[PDB]
Amino acid sequence: PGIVELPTLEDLKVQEVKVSSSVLKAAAHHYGAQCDKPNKEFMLCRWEEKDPRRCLEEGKLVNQCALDFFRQIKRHCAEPFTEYWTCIDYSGLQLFRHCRKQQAKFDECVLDKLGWVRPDLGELSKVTKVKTDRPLPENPYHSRARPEPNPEAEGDLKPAKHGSRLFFWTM
Amino acid sequence: KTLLHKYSDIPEGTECHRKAYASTSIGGATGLIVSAYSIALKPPASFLEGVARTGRYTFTSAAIGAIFGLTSCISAQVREKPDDPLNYFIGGCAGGLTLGARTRSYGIGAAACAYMGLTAALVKMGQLEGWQVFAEPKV
Amino acid sequence: TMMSGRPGRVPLQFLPNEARSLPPPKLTDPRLVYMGFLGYCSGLIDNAIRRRPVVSAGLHRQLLYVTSFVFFGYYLLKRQDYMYALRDHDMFAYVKSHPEDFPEKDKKTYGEILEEFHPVR
Amino acid sequence: MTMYIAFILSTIFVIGFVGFSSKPSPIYGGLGLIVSGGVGCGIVLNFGGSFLGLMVFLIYLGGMLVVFGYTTAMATEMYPEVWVSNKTVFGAFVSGLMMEFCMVYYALKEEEVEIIFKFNGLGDWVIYDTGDSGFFSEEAMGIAALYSYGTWLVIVTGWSLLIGVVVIMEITRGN
Amino acid sequence: MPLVYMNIIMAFAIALAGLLMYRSHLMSSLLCLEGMMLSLFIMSTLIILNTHFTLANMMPIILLVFAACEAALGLSLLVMVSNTYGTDYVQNLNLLQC
Amino acid sequence: PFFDVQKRLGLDLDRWMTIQSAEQPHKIPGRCHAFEKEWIECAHGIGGIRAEKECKIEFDDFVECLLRQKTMKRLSAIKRQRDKLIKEGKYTPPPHHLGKEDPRP
Amino acid sequence: MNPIIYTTLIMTVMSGTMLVMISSHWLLIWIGFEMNLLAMIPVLMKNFNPRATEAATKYFLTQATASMMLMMAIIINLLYSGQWTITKMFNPVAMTMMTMALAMKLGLSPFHFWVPEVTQGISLQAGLLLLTWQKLAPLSVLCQISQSINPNLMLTMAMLSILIGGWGGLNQTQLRKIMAYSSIAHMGWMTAVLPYNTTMTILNLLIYITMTLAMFMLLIHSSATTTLSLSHTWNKMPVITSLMMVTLLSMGGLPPLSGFMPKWMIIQEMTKNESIIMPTLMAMTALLNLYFYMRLAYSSSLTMFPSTNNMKMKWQFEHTKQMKLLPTMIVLSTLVLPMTPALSSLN
Amino acid sequence: MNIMLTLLTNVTLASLLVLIAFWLPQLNAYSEKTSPFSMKFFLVAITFLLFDLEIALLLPLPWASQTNNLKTMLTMALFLLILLAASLAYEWTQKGLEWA
């Protein structure tokens, strides 16, 4: 059938958040607290559209917001955060428990210099509203026209014209 | 089903050698099937005994098919009536005679001629009139 | 098959509420009388098997047989009439809904038609 | 070579099936079944079914056939029948391997083999999905839903096992 | 269909053929029954895992539950046959004919 | 004789596992949820006989998603021709496909 | 076997068939078949004889192979369609395998060889359960999948079943084997109309079930398993052998007895579908069944075979146990022909 | 590949020892040294099987505890366990547990 419309390489080139998993996990709570709006917008786009191609720009905005978040962290709280993620990196499961003291240091510094407040338990998991100017996809599944239903329930029931009409039976 | 298609594609009363060959193949297939079932249900004492029984049944059936097709197509050519079921009847009676000869019994030969010829004429009549042994559910 | 997949058919329902529109089977229906006759024969056969007097013993048992057969036969006849009425209704509705598939045919008098004669000589 | 571990394992599975299908003494048959069960566990693990494949290793190998063996031991035969013991067993064993080789070669040589169904010779890695299951084992959750969704299955299976205990007792009564 | 499906279907076909062609022992045939069940388990598991039919990942387990029930029934019959004839040989199941 | 007792009594004894697009734990989607949903929505209330031809496109897409016979056939053709060109020497795989560039994160 | 356990096993058999006729998911239908087998096997061996064990083993092997083929067919249909629902089967190979499995469960030839042996091995009551109740589940499954069924395979199996059921019965002097071959022939008759109209199959199944219930209950009442033991019955219970003769004539299909209506309606539906040769051959081949029915009738009731001196002892006593439904079963099996148009109820 | 490596290494090591213990000491020079009842208690083995089936059915329970319908899950789990206990009790009372 038709040709797949894959986007060009140039349009999909974006600045990359080149930080390891432990670094992201260390800042995960404050990253979610600060960069929620673009992330929620991109998620809504992806789930409504169901096409990765349609929401490339929202992904670009998410990446840019993450980069800004990390630039602010580098500007204001570089050393405490480095210590925090080096502590987290050691543990194979990257557990939060073992690095509570470094977490406290980083949280205190970030609250002082940048004013960020760590989201509490059960907060980042809440379903949130997103106000978007992108229109709702009319036919996200690209479904064809549904076949027309059969006619049904014409009207009332009347007795058989002459009964069973089975061979010789008169009733 | 390919063998049946081969027999059907050859026009009736033409290319008698090919028609005889197709009938011989059909008989061979049926004989092999009967041989396999006989070997299963009634075990042969030895592998050589099984081969002998299989060859006997298959040759009987192949001879029956070859004679039926050969005689039927020859009769269609000579009489020059292609669609007449009598050609098939003659072929069937000839096949029954061959069955009697292979069984070395006259009564088997006569009964086989009668019944097989009647069935062959019936098959030709079904071809002509569009009779369906198995009918697609149309209700 | 056939009526099994009719739209709106409530599963495992002996008599749908639509059936009440149809006339009930008359209690003097010959079919119901035949059902009662079958029950009476069952009573006679039960007596014969148990070596009781065939036509006199167990009048209560024979009465129960006849009553049960008639009672079940009444609903059996009602459902039968319902199913036949449903068939007729569906057939007429389909005929109306597909006029092309059931075209009216021009009627001609026998004088107009020509039917060949085969003399019996 | 590691590209077709699933195919190598499937071939070993077929070989074990030919082994216990040729019917040597139930001891060697049991060996073939045990090898086939382990290999099937391997294939299932490769496709991501760790739990399911491990189930065969325990409730099939160390279960149904662990008693199959205990049974054969009670009904000991005079001689341990092997593939070579009967010419037919050895011949069928060889023919079975040959049959596998023929289809295997045909599938690889003819990009599209069609025995009864249509099979493509591309490696099984092709069919795998590129999605992510997150913090979950999909097999584990599906199997654990037997208690949350498949309550009806639980009822029927438990009743069948109880009636199986009763049935085995009655069959082994012997009057 | 990938080749693994071909192999497993071939395994089931081989096991079925082995079951349908007894030689002497009933235990070998019961081994073929258990083997066919293994083929079915592997095939079902591969299908369900590939299609991500999460709610069907329990079907292989129920299949095996009833596979072992069937095996147990087979052994429970085989022991009685052996007791009545002294062997598990199929040729002793000859009293009933036609 | 399929006495639809489940539909009469409103009991979901086994219909939950009938289809892959039904509700699944933690809303884990099937690999062919979209195609199956489309095929069922197309073939709903029109009868099996009509559904066998009026929804054949949806069913073919569903079958292709399930088995990927055509996708594997296309990929096999691609690999065949790539091997052929490599043997002829008129093709050279790009460096990124050879692993000479870091893949996108 | 403890009577509570016997009731539990029978209820398990019936529950397996109900699951088969009630579930819309293939796995559960196969589960119902597995339960039917598991519960049935000990029931066949209620009276422990070497023949009972042999019959149970044969039946288990046959039903186990049928179930395995059925599960493979289900798995293949899953592979090619991804649907568990009992509906049109989307792979022809799966359809053929499922048809073979269900035919083997039904005892349709050429998977008939186990029916006579199992019926002879088990007692008359177990035979009644085997030849009446067990047929319900596979026939239900076939009716649900009738549209997918390739008519050629089903018709060939039906015709072969009729032929073999007619042929085998002529050679049998054992009542149970005669009943098994008759069951094979009637199963062929029922499966003949399966591609065309399932209601006819249901009607034939009901008529056959009534007739076989009546015949087996009469045999149990007469405690006869051989033709001569049944011949001795005229001296003791002449009414029993008279009713047996009437039921045999019904089973042969003679008008105006009730056995005529299933054949009549089957021929009608087949002719409506332009099948003329097949109904003709089936009706003619039923004459073999009619023949061995008539021979049994000659042995039993129409002619008085010699008795034994010890029968004078049995004259004094009377039958202790009463089978309540036997009279009604006889009446339905023999005198329901004037009431065919009621075949729209099961419709 | 790690699990496959472990399996290979262990099997090869054990088989190597079996070789050095079946053939290597067999070289040492020596001389010539010359040189069942039907268990009906196998019912215990068969009962193990049907109990091992329930064992398999019960293994998913740790993940089953993570559902939101904990009421239904608990009811069905106790149902299976009570059916197993009933089976054991039945076999016990009917003297079916005639070990040895």
Curated annotation (Swiss-Prot), chain D:
Q: Which UniProt keywords apply?
A: Electron transport, Membrane, Mitochondrion, Mitochondrion inner membrane, NAD, Respiratory chain, Translocase, Transmembrane, Transmembrane helix, Transport, Ubiquinone
Entry keyword annotation includes Transit peptide: no
Which reaction(s) are listed as its catalytic activity?
a ubiquinone + NADH + 5 H(+)(in) = a ubiquinol + NAD(+) + 4 H(+)(out)
Q: Which GO terms describe its biological process?
A: mitochondrial electron transport, NADH to ubiquinone; mitochondrial respiratory chain complex I assembly
Q: How does it sit in the membrane?
A: Multi-pass membrane protein
Please tell me where this protein is predominantly located.
mitochondrion
According to the record, the segments passing through the membrane are 1-21, 25-45, 47-67, 88-108, 149-169
| Top EC class of this enzyme | translocase
Name the GO cellular-component terms: mitochondrial inner membrane; mitochondrion; respiratory chain complex I
Cross-referenced Pfam families? Oxidored_q3
Q: List the disulfide bonds.
A: none
A GO molecular function held by the record: NADH dehydrogenase (ubiquinone) activity
Q: What is its EC number?
A: 7.1.1.2
What are the subcellular locations of this protein? Mitochondrion inner membrane
Which function does this protein serve? Core subunit of the mitochondrial membrane respiratory chain NADH dehydrogenase (Complex I) which catalyzes electron transfer from NADH through the respiratory chain, using ubiquinone as an electron acceptor. Essential for the catalytic activity and assembly of complex I.
Family statement drawn from the similarity comment of this UniProt entry: Belongs to the complex I subunit 6 family.
Describe its partners and assembly state. Core subunit of respiratory chain NADH dehydrogenase (Complex I) which is composed of 45 different subunits.
Name of this chain's protein: NADH-ubiquinone oxidoreductase chain 6
Swiss-Prot record, chain E:
Q: How does it sit in the membrane?
A: Multi-pass membrane protein
Per its UniProt entry, which superkingdom is the organism in? Answer: Eukaryota
One CC-aspect GO term: mitochondrial inner membrane
Q: What is its EC number?
A: 7.1.1.2
What reactions does this protein catalyze? a ubiquinone + NADH + 5 H(+)(in) = a ubiquinol + NAD(+) + 4 H(+)(out)
Q: Which InterPro entries match?
A: NADH_UbQ_OxRdtase_chain4L/K (IPR001133), NUOK/Mnh_C1-like (IPR039428)
Looking at the UniProt entry, the stretches that span the membrane are: 1-21, 29-49, 61-81
Q: What is annotated about its quaternary structure and interactions?
A: Core subunit of respiratory chain NADH dehydrogenase (Complex I) which is composed of 45 different subunits.
Entry function: Core subunit of the mitochondrial membrane respiratory chain NADH dehydrogenase (Complex I) which catalyzes electron transfer from NADH through the respiratory chain, using ubiquinone as an electron acceptor. Part of the enzyme membrane arm which is embedded in the lipid bilayer and involved in proton translocation.
Q: Which family does it belong to?
A: Belongs to the complex I subunit 4L family.
Which protein is depicted?
NADH-ubiquinone oxidoreductase chain 4L
This protein's species is: Sus scrofa
Cite the source lineage: Eukaryota, Metazoa, Chordata, Craniata, Vertebrata
- Name the gene behind this protein: MT-ND4L
Curated annotation (Swiss-Prot), chain G:
Q: Does the keyword Aminoacyl-tRNA synthetase apply?
A: no
| A single BP term in Gene Ontology | mitochondrial respiratory chain complex I assembly
Give Gene Ontology CC terms. Answer: mitochondrial inner membrane; respiratory chain complex I
Top-level lineage group: Eukaryota
The regions listed as transmembrane in this protein's record are 3-23, 25-45, 59-79, 89-109, 149-169, 178-198, 200-220, 237-257, 274-294, 325-345
Q: Which residues form the signal peptide?
A: none
- Where in the cell does this protein reside? Mitochondrion inner membrane
Catalyses which reaction? a ubiquinone + NADH + 5 H(+)(in) = a ubiquinol + NAD(+) + 4 H(+)(out)
Q: Does the keyword Translocase apply?
A: yes
Classify the protein's membrane topology as the record does.
Answer: Multi-pass membrane protein
EC assignment: 7.1.1.2
Q: Which UniProt keywords apply?
A: Electron transport, Membrane, Mitochondrion, Mitochondrion inner membrane, NAD, Respiratory chain, Translocase, Transmembrane, Transmembrane helix, Transport, Ubiquinone
GO molecular function: any one?
NADH dehydrogenase (ubiquinone) activity
Query: Record's InterPro entries?
Result: Complex_I_Subunit_2, NADH_DH_su2_C, NADH_UbQ_OxRdtase_chain2, ND/Mrp_TM
Q: Which Pfam families match?
A: NADH_dehy_S2_C (PF06444), Proton_antipo_M (PF00361)
Give the family, as the similarity comment puts it: Belongs to the complex I subunit 2 family.
Q: How does it assemble?
A: Core subunit of respiratory chain NADH dehydrogenase (Complex I) which is composed of 45 different subunits. Interacts with TMEM242.
What does the record give as the function of this protein?
Core subunit of the mitochondrial membrane respiratory chain NADH dehydrogenase (Complex I) which catalyzes electron transfer from NADH through the respiratory chain, using ubiquinone as an electron acceptor. Essential for the catalytic activity and assembly of complex I.
Name of the molecule in the record:
NADH-ubiquinone oxidoreductase chain 2
Classification from the root reads: Eukaryota, Metazoa, Chordata, Craniata, Vertebrata
Swiss-Prot record, chain H:
An example of a GO molecular function for this protein is:
NADH dehydrogenase (ubiquinone) activity
One GO term describing the cellular component: mitochondrial inner membrane
Ranges annotated as spanning the membrane: 3-23, 41-61, 72-92
- Full protein name: NADH-ubiquinone oxidoreductase chain 3
Source species taxonomy: Eukaryota, Metazoa, Chordata, Craniata, Vertebrata
State the oligomer form and interacting partners: Core subunit of respiratory chain NADH dehydrogenase (Complex I) which is composed of 45 different subunits. Interacts with TMEM186. Interacts with TMEM242.
Subcellular location(s) per record = Mitochondrion inner membrane
**How does the protein's chain sit in the membrane according to the entry?**
Multi-pass membrane protein
Its annotated function is as follows:
Core subunit of the mitochondrial membrane respiratory chain NADH dehydrogenase (Complex I) which catalyzes electron transfer from NADH through the respiratory chain, using ubiquinone as an electron acceptor. Essential for the catalytic activity of complex I.
As recorded in UniProt, its EC number(s) are: 7.1.1.2
The record's keywords, sorted A to Z, are: Electron transport, Membrane, Mitochondrion, Mitochondrion inner membrane, NAD, Respiratory chain, Translocase, Transmembrane, Transmembrane helix, Transport, Ubiquinone
Matching PANTHER family: NADH-UBIQUINONE OXIDOREDUCTASE CHAIN 3
Instruction: Provide an example Pfam family for this protein.
Output: Oxidored_q4
Q: Which InterPro entries match?
A: NADH_UbQ/plastoQ_OxRdtase_su3, NDAH_ubi_oxred_su3_sf
Per the record, the similarity remark reads: Belongs to the complex I subunit 3 family.
**Is NAD found in the keyword set?**
yes
Catalytic reactions of this protein: a ubiquinone + NADH + 5 H(+)(in) = a ubiquinol + NAD(+) + 4 H(+)(out)
